[PDB]
Ligand binder design. Structure first.
Ligand SMILES: CC(=O)SCCNC(=O)CCNC(=O)[C@H](O)C(C)(C)COP(=O)(O)OP(=O)(O)OC[C@H]1O[C@@H](n2cnc3c(N)ncnc32)[C@H](O)[C@@H]1OP(=O)(O)O
Lengths: 114, 316, 56, 316
């Protein structure tokens, strides 16, 4: 909704949609990190906290993104950074400002130092 | 002051001390000191292996916090010479939780940035338990820029509980300062090497740890969050810290397989604290080896390699 | 705020970590309400990129 | 609130005000307002020339401090559009004694940095009488860098009594911040134009005034030290300020001959305060003309010319 609100209509193009969590730390909390991963993914309808959608602003190309705080506190998971890199790379290859919105409670603990 | 599980080592040490007194205490007492010293040292050496063979991640964390250990000052003294300490951010204060300076390594000049918990209570409170307010990280950025400018390599030590969680620290752009630090260090035209001596992590540690190479002792924990914090938030308790430590993967070998750190520097038995000189020598050898195979690459190739390695972060 | 509360074991200042407070303390540029946001970004970016101003 | 020597102008104004009331006050009073208004305005217009013809340097200083005048906010409003105010040094605070922002000048985008004394007592104390603590100058450096990065020209207004002489200002590297400001501004790859609207000087003013061109109103004083300070130190008194003003050469035409400033923008009669719109138009025309003949030169030639002009400073 945020991305649609900012970007113009009909020019939206999602980026990094094939990137999904691939937990390897098998983090065993009170719940299993895979449990929370799947629960958030189905509850919010998004693979991870961050969404990226190339678009246009008043006829000017631009790249936007935002955090879905509902996703495990919107933590910056591996996919979050990977999509961030994807968006920045898109902005670099095609000359266009890049914008983002911040909403998170901290880095994704379950992935530890990753 | 040895830890709780180092007790058998202690009592044997406690018998050992009064051997000096019995040498010349009183009543003509000068016993055959050498025989008893040799036997008790033999037993103590045998027992430490009986004690440090069976330690795991929760212990490793305790050892990483042994209140008798070399801090960055100690490694500087025992592996560096002609050390000049630059103190001052140029903005609001110099911080005692970070100590930086310019020194020589086997003739070669280097920059040394790292934390200093202070030894006893007094130097611990004077240095804020190695917890840096942001002005410290601004100072570290300033020094790192200076080192970059004059074609000088950077050696960084990392031993911090974390960025200070206080009113003064938050007011002055803590997040902003650390963000800038993480931005500049990823563009310097000089090689960067960063150890994980002692206890470090919690992000603020990364402010001076983004380099070509990364190294860690065998009893040093590098956790995005202290085990106690992870326990409180997730386990809903504090006593369950060891489970958090086991799960997170804060121990060096666990991290080593993760392609996160480039080498582990083995410790003297019983912890580096028992032989600080040996640990300093090992660290100096590792640092020199790291610098050697690094100087071959040119500055542009150095930065390109640094960027590429960063991108390898995360399974994605 | 919980971590800082336990650490400093005191009362945090009112408006702690609030945008109306972190613009007072220099870390925050400008406070924008959501409805303007798209125009506010559009005008600023059309300026910086040096493009002609957007048409309302 | 007109100055002491603007009294004859005042009393004529004082008769003029109640003309509005007499128009519809009471008792059916609606007199032939137009005739009296025309005659009194004629007399007032004639008298101001009788008053502002014979003012000299001590007065100029008083007029430069007229407590009814356009500050940088006023010139921004009356000559600039699409103004966006960026507040924040990123370190410790944003300062109210400096206001910066990014705006458009006749379509063209620009950066505007300058001071704001505040109009009345409340906005004067809230902005510290236009006296900037160093964090303000760090903010100004940050904005100037931003403007340089995106090939954007910089327009700067200068209206400051001086850098704040206070504990907080000295503690935070006042000297350091101003030194850095004076260093960076002399390397930007974008043209720089700087007026001297209002009262400015005392070094701290120079923090945002090192550019390709310099311009000053006809009643604006630019003194390395306020006249009162020079009087106290040298004359051993304060009352002898006018002599200090006469000696120093703080008036625009006196400075103009010194090759220090590139143009004087003529004022509306009686001071720019009587016709702020006319002054704003004159300033906008001067700024546009300055930018025009400046954009022809390339960035490298721009910086070379800037450096060469600096070296012309001082008779040596
Ligand atoms: C060290 C780090 O970077 S992570 C440490 C945790 N974060 C912090 O210390 C900073 C802020 N701390 C917080 O508790 C919050 O983010 C606050 C202060 C903004 C409060 O926001 P709240 O409205 O309380 O949100 P809350 O913390 O409940 O977040 C919602 C959910 O996200 C989860 N979450 C948030 N951040 C994280 C994180 N970094 N890792 C894992 N889960 C997280 C919470 O567990 C919670 O899950 P639950 O509702 O199913 O129990």
């Amino acid at each position: 909704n945020r991305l649609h609100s900012l970007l113009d209509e009909g020019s939206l193009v999602e980026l990094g949609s094939e990137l999904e969590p691939k937990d390897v730390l098998k983090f065993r909390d009170s719940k299993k990190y895979k449990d929370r991963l799947a629960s958030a993914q189905k509850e919010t309808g998004e693979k991870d906290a961050l969404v990226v959608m190339k678009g246009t602003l008043y006829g000017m190309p631009v790249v936007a993104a935002a955090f879905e705080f509902a996703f495990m506190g919107g933590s910056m998971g591996s996919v979050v950074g990977a999509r961030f890199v994807r968006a920045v790379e898109q902005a670099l290859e095609d000359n266009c400002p890049l914008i983002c919105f911040s909403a998170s409670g901290g880095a994704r603990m379950q992935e530890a130092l990753m | 002051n040895f830890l709780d599980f180092e007790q058998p080592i202690a009592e044997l040490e406690a018998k050992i001390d009064s051997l000096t007194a019995v040498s010349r205490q009183d009543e003509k007492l000068d016993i055959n000191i050498d025989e008893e010293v040799h036997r008790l040292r033999e037993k103590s050496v045998e027992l430490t292996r009986k004690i440090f063979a069976d330690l795991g991640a929760w212990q490793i964390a305790q050892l990483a916090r042994h209140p008798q250990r070399p801090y960055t000052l100690d490694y500087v003294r025992l592996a560096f010479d002609e050390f000049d300490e630059l103190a001052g951010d140029r903005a609001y204060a110099d911080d005692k939780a970070i100590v930086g300076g310019i020194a020589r390594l086997d003739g070669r000049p280097v920059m040394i940035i790292g934390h200093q918990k202070g030894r006893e209570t007094k130097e611990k409170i004077r240095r804020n338990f190695g917890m840096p307010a942001p002005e410290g990280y601004r100072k570290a950025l300033r020094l790192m820029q200076m080192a970059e400018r004059f074609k000088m390599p950077i050696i960084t030590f990392i031993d911090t509980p974390g960025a200070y969680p206080g009113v003064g620290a938050e007011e002055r752009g803590q997040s902003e300062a650390i963000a800038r630090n993480l931005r500049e260090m990823s563009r310097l035209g000089v090689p960067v090497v960063c150890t994980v001596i002692g206890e470090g992590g919690s992000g603020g540690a990364l402010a001076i740890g983004v380099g070509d190479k990364v190294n860690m002792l065998q009893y040093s924990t590098y956790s995005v969050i202290s085990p106690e914090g992870c326990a409180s938030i997730l386990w809903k308790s504090a006593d369950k810290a060891p489970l958090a430590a086991e799960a997170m993967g804060i121990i060096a070998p666990r991290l080593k397989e993760l392609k996160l750190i480039d080498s582990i520097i083995p410790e003297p038995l019983g912890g580096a604290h028992r032989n600080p000189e040996a640990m300093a020598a090992s660290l100096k050898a590792q640092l020199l080896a790291d610098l050697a195979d690094l100087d071959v690459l040119s500055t542009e190739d150095l930065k390109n390699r640094r960027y590429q390695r960063l991108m390898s972060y995360g399974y994605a | 705020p919980r971590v800082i509360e336990q650490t400093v074991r005191e009362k945090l200042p009112p408006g702690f970590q609030r945008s109306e407070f972190l613009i007072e303390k220099g870390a925050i540029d400008m406070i924008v309400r959501r409805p303007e946001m798209r125009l506010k970004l559009a005008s600023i970016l059309a300026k910086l990129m040096n493009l002609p101003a957007p048409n309302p």
